Symmetry: D2
Subunit: 272 residues, 4 copies
């Protein structure tokens, strides 16, 4: 059984291919920051030899208080990815929230993204189904790994057949998430074997980002989604749990050593 | 400690007042159906003596397949509640999904409603925060009962201080919901004691709608949300689990006998 | 469909009969305490009109530190229930832990009890299966409500067909319990409709013992298990959460008003 | 921070040392089977270079029906490990259930074992606390990873300071288990850094035994517990999910490649 490949330009994402990193930051605070962050990634990846798709959000739909930092905005956010593309030559992956934002961003960026909270939103999906651009469905925390068929189906119909599934853990009691390492295969299966990626930073609402990233990779994955910040501490807020830039490399060496050791194993059948 | 009252016209919703029923149907299939359903409710309530707010959806945002029954639509759906208002003289409660639908419906209906999937959507909330109409926040299944403060806060700010909290269970493992009967007080507390209601039919993804409705009511609640259909069987699909019209009355007698017996108990303190 | 009755002397426990209280204390600290506690129960029940089966533990198998208060012991504990029986004329319900303690206690007490931790212990069950005395199986927190068939089966075989099922909640994430109010019927069903009782104090690892007891009773139950202490505060430790003696009555009035209102309802079918 | 070592004869178990396999079978059906199984392990380990502690149960306390295969028995079971020791020269690890079985087995075998169901059993623990032999505490499914302090404490007191912690997943809703890969560090921590091992076969109530074993090992563990059977199919029953003997080797190559790649990584700090 072969894996479905979903190519993002020259990059080919797929469950049996070496993992692709969809690194980056959470929100686009300031280009001086984006630029620095994305600068460090590019360098680290390039050096270690890892495909990459810088990720960042230009909009914040579910923030605290109305009087909060919405975000650059779609019209000002998009202009930033512009500069980063030229200056660095990397792919941009961003999340849309309203059915109208679909097409605009589709041009500007390589891989768009569907938020879990909305995963189940026909109008927004169909609008993304149009564009035809690479789709990344974030697996909602309140949905089992085997329900990811209808989501991919609802995209096939929309004329879009380039989809990646992102897992970020599941609810474990109140205010808590646990990642089911068995959920990754159950997702490959029901999705025609589409690419499955692990959003480690977002599955961790710590000095834990590593042990948890190793377990994910050892399973064998198409990719890995993560976020980092120059100063996690002071800047700490809530939602995800960013990785410390200065640790990117020794952390990515961890993955490769795993993603390679495992990515080249003789198929095993514990089934019989 | 007194309870916050949120009046919907002549109706006053509140945790220590007799429960209000927000009955109705799931979607607005056809007026000949709406009319029949709402006809049976009105009669049954009126007879037994229960405040009531017919409920129905004119739009379906998260349905299966793009080629499915979207719904009447906002422009054709609203015209229906019109006729039902005059013909019956009951309150209308409906759910909006896009920040623009806010105001239109605000006029047409008494109590609007915020979907859980979007509960965390500032733009849509703020747009609902404007209208100033009575708000009903559906407690997401992936959020603990004590997180319902920020939601009510984000509404106060929007200039809207008329809010009801609706509980519909919490994730219990994969593809399953359990209702925490302790969640109701933890919600009254963090919400300035705003009204809390139980969506029994939606907390049941059966011959169970009753035993589960009794436990909810015995706790003591501001209200109760439910849905019924003339023929649950054949029409069965998915999402909620409608009540059989023909059983409304013997089921509502159950509640009153509970909601009254409990609603008039001498405050008890097991605390000390 | 009629309910299986399990009579404890002159007392008949059963799902459609008025609820039986299996009140009491946690451990047998001192007779001066047992006597006081059991004195207050007897009086309160007798007065309100409720069957009763004083409960207490003479042994503590899973306590903290080896250097802790084991408990009176089986040989000294049993002597206490002796005095209480004569002085008060009430039934005694206690838990055994080792296959040998079975018979001794069987004489001394009316209703024995099987701990959840051991629920799955053939030797201990079979030893209890012998005695022939009334059995009370505590539903383990890590076992679904529909697995309670094998336990009752494994008792039928042992020649014992007098069994009650006690529910005390289920694991909800780490260090937490939620009570599934739907679990009670699923238990009646698979157990030939044997009596089902709710251990409210033990399902609460508060000023919550009441709201949670009302929901349980409103479902409709054969009985109710609870524990109380003169001074919950200072004495507070861990395991259960005792009720304040001084609140027994106003709390039991709550139940009767529920257990009676519900226990005499016209059978309802939300099924069709 | 160094790890606590717990040596079983010439074998040293510890979180930063290469993983130790505690392979074997579930129950001791027949020596012709034990011998075959243990024969295949010994050979495979010896060849690949892995410490090993054959495991098997001589007693079945929580089986179905009283009329089931109890097991060889303590007096006949122990005689078997005898023969296997001489014939193969491997360590024996077995589980005891009654406070009296403690010492007898302590002689006969290298590493004893405490069942989760009883994890919280002072008398049985203290009896095991005596013997002084290597202890293996099975982490109950209904207990969080940070509660494993009291268990190790209750053993220190008993005069026994040679303990290993075994994780086999946690309850995820009804009748289901999920393994929290973050639970392993939280266990090292509260246990003075005692050895932590993963019972993969028992955390799986499949063709999944592998992907799940890789994630566990990639975290970094002191050991790994597993069970295999010549013919998993036909023999299938319930409790665990045995590995197919014929797949031991290609499955253990998987682990070593992981346990070695990870066991020799430059300590990383994602903390800051």
């Amino acid at each position: 059984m072969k894996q479905k490949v979903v190519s993002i330009g020259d990059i080919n994402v797929a469950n049996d291919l070496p993992f692709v990193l969809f690194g980056g930051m959470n929100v686009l605070e300031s280009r001086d920051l984006a630029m620095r962050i994305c600068e460090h990634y590019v360098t680290v990846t390039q050096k270690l030899g890892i495909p990459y798709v810088f990720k960042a959000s230009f909009d914040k739909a579910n923030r605290s208080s109305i009087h909060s930092y919405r975000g650059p905005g779609l019209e000002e956010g998009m202009k930033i990815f512009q500069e980063l593309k030229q200056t660095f030559g990397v792919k941009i992956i961003t999340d849309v929230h309203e059915p109208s934002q679909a097409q605009p961003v589709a041009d500007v960026v390589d891989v768009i993204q569907l938020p879990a909270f909305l995963a189940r939103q026909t109008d927004l999906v169909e609008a993304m189904a149009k564009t035809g651009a690479v789709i990344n469905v974030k697996k909602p925390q309140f949905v089992s790994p085997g329900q990811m068929g209808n989501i991919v189906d609802k995209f096939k119909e929309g004329g879009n057949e380039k989809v990646i599934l992102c897992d970020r853990g599941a609810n474990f009691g109140y205010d808590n998430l646990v990642v089911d390492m068995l959920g990754f295969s159950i997702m490959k299966k029901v999705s025609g074997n589409s690419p499955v990626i692990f959003d480690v930073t977002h599955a961790l609402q710590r000095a834990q980002v590593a042990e948890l990233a190793r377990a994910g990779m050892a399973v064998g994955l198409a990719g890995l989604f993560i976020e980092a910040h120059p100063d996690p501490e002071h800047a700490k807020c809530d939602g995800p749990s960013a990785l410390p830039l200065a640790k990117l490399e020794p952390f990515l060496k961890q993955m490769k050593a795993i993603d390679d050791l495992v990515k080249g194993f003789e198929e095993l059948d514990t089934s019989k």
